């Protein structure tokens, strides 16, 4: 849950950017100022979604690696034929499973990379791989989640 989630912060000046152009440059500097965060209320987009945009899944992680964007930060990345707007963590989770189970596409046909992962959220995913895939391949799916869960957690602070 910690890893796949987003944030939201202070709303000062009204920011409904989806429309204007000068509502990008001016708000990008103000972001470098003390009013428009990166997790700011930007309906169609928050300055975060503009600044960082990555080409490859990996790309996202290194950034996190370098203290650029945290896993819970609003970013834009390029997954199969689509400019997905999400967080590094959310994309990480996808991998975590995509890896656990190499059928990278299937892994997509069942995970809701849009909401935080809770108890039911997962439950669904488990009962999913069960039906869809094998059974034993689902044994490892759990263990995988066991691992990435016992680890992120300890650092979640």
């Amino acid at each position: 849950y910690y890893i796949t989630q987003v944030r939201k912060e202070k709303k000062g000046a009204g920011l409904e950017f989806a429309t204007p152009e000068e509502a990008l440059a001016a708000h990008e500097r103000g972001e470098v100022a003390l009013n428009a965060p990166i997790k700011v209320a930007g309906r169609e987009t928050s300055v975060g979604r503009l600044k960082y945009v990555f080409a490859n899944p990996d790309e996202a992680l290194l950034a996190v690696a370098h203290g650029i964007v945290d896993l819970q930060d609003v970013v834009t990345v390029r997954y199969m034929g689509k400019r997905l707007e999400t967080s590094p963590g959310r994309i990480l989770f996808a991998r975590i499973v995509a890896e656990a189970v190499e059928d990278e596409k299937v892994a997509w046909e069942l995970i809701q990379l849009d909401v935080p992962q809770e108890k039911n959220s997962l439950k669904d995913l488990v009962y999913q791989a069960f039906l869809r895939l094998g059974m034993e391949k689902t044994a490892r799916l759990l263990d995988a989640l066991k691992y990435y869960g016992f680890t992120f957690s300890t650092t979640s602070g």
Partner: protein
């Protein structure tokens, strides 16, 4: 868990059968030394202090590594109950 437990669970008409079958074959895989096996040459059973599972480790792990590969045969009533143990004690050395 176990290598292809599904494929195994799918080559029979009941969960409880696969069990018997692997069980019965395993017993005979011992009752008659360890040469009545249906496979062996290349990549097959193995342990590690030295590669010694090749001879006598798990009875049943074998039953399941054989019955999984489409070599063995089994049925409700395939071959006459008594003459079975006969030939079997006749073709396979081990004791």
């Amino acid at each position: 868990a176990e290598p292809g437990i599904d494929k195994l669970f799918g080559m029979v008409d009941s969960k409880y059968r696969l069990t018997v079958v692997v069980a019965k074959r395993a017993q005979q895989l011992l009752r008659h030394g360890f040469k009545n096996t249906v496979l062996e040459p290349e990549e097959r059973p193995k342990m590690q202090t030295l590669e010694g599972l090749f001879d006598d480790p798990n009875a049943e792990t074998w039953a399941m590594k054989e019955l999984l590969t489409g070599r063995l045969v089994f049925g409700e009533n395939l071959v006459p109950e008594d003459r079975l143990q006969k030939e079997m004690e006749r073709i396979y050395p081990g004791e």
